[PDB]
Design a protein around this nucleic acid. Sequence first.
DNA 1: GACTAGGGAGTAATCCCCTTGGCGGTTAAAACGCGGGGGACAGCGCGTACGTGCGTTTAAGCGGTGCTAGAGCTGTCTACGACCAATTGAGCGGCCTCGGCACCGGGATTCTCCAGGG
Length: 49
Amino acid sequence: LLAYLACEKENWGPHLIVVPTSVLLNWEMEFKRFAPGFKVLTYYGSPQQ
DNA sequence: GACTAGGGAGTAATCCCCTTGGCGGTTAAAACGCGGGGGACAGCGCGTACGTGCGTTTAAGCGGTGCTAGAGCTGTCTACGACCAATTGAGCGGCCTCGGCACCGGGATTCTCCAGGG
């Protein structure tokens, strides 16, 4: 769905994926193996980083 | 005068929202440990600034005096302050905003360390 929105429409602005903690890595890998044309951010890991 | 009709209280069933405990998940603050280095402190030397003895004087205590202007108490009155309430407005009790505060980001600016040569 997001890939279709990014291809058919010129809008691929910052979207949010709210997920449980356990799948936090899996999602960023889910379209790493799959469509990699997006820039993914992972938010976790102490205040510093 | 005998019995009739209707509605809010008495009795009761419904709802249902409100919390008592325990337990798991997850982030943040607290807890612990090492390399190394800068702060604490000894050993010491000294000089010069006081610690101390003695001469030679001004000065507080001494001893007394003659009063002098400010301080305590005696009437005495009278201007004023603590005694009811009508008031009626100065101001507080409860609610509704939008704005300054909360707080984080991009950047310019600034504060600090080093391994070398200069």
